[PDB]
């Protein structure tokens, strides 16, 4: 099974870096990404593809001790989100 | 105004932190992000919208040289796509 990680993270550079680096450094591949600015805000939403997994509950409270993650949700996005949007842009 | 960057890129860990890092070691914000795995092989799709910069010829061919980057395109992308998907996910 797959589930959906949501950040809202601060939209400044090198930030996206520092959230795929605990992905990367565990081998936990990461299936889809979606990033989006937040209108009128220097935030931006971050939506991760992620099997679900015994480690990804060590993994939220890295994500959230982060300095620029403000906030992390696991299960509040129907995972076909990625299969929705795979229909318009392959 | 922006440009999107179409990567193809292998699905495995650790690749989207290699491409973001290279954003990020030259202080350079990463506005829109979509990676979808490309069916029935090990390759995936990597959408970055970025602004428009002197810096991004020569970012593009670094990208390039990335072992697990086998292509990189530019401005050969639906223009309006992070708009059509902020339409639905925001
Ligand atoms: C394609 C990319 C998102 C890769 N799966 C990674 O985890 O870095
Ligand atoms: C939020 C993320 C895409 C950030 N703007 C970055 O460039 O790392």
Same mark, same amino acid.
């Given at each position: 099974? =797959?589930? %959906?990680?949501?950040?809202? *993270? $601060? =939209? !400044?550079?090198?930030?996206?870096? !520092? ?5 990367? $450094? $565990?081998?936990? =591949? ?7 600015? %937040? /209108?009128?805000?220097?935030?931006? !939403?971050?939506?991760?593809?992620? =099997?679900? @997994? /015994? ?8 994500? @959230? ?6 906030? *992390?949700? $696991? ?11 795979? *229909?318009?842009?392959?």
């Amino acid at each position: 099974d =797959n589930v %959906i990680l949501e950040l809202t *993270v $601060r =939209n !400044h550079p090198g930030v996206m870096t !520092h959230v795929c680096g605990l992905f990367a $450094r $565990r081998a936990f =591949n990461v299936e889809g990404i979606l990033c989006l600015p %937040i /209108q009128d805000s220097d935030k931006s !939403h971050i939506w991760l593809l992620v =099997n679900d @997994d /015994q480690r990804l509950e060590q993994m939220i409270s890295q994500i @959230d001790k982060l300095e620029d993650v403000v906030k *992390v949700q $696991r299960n509040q996005s129907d995972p076909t989100m990625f299969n929705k949007i795979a *229909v318009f842009f392959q």
